[PDB]
Amino acid sequence: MIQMAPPSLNVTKDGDSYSLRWETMKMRYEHIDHTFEIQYRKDTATWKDSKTETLQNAHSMALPALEPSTRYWARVRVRTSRTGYNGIWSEWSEARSWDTES
Numbered sequence: 441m442i443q444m445a446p447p448s449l450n451v452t453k454d455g456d457s458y459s460l461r462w463e464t465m466k467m468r469y470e471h472i473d474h475t476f477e478i479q480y481r482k483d484t485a486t487w488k489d490s491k492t493e494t495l496q497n498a499h500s501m502a503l504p505a506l507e508p509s510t511r512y513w514a515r516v517r518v519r520t521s522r523t524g525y526n527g528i529w530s531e532w533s534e535a536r537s538w539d540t541e542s
Contacts, residue, residue: 446533460501462516473521483511513537
């Protein structure tokens with residue numbers, strides 16, 4: 441059994457422009473930083489082509505580098521930036537695919 445568990449990732453658009461929305465509740469420890477490694481790929485490219493965004497103590501992102509008519513598959517990596525913590529990470533949040541319409 442692994443450790444911790446990635447939050448619930450979900451994209452929400454407000455006029456073409458999409459944005460991530462992840463909420464963590466598997467920590468409830470203290471005022472931790474909790475770094476979030478964002479990775480948004482697509483159905484046309486590969487995860488390797490995706491972009492690795494660093495979401496520090498953040499609970500969402502503003503997917504800027506996207507493209508219409510493309511299935512964007514993103515995910516979130518939540519670690520445990522407890523200042524004096526080792527240096528592990530999560531098992532990558534369940535990938536999510538969303539359409540960017542046209």
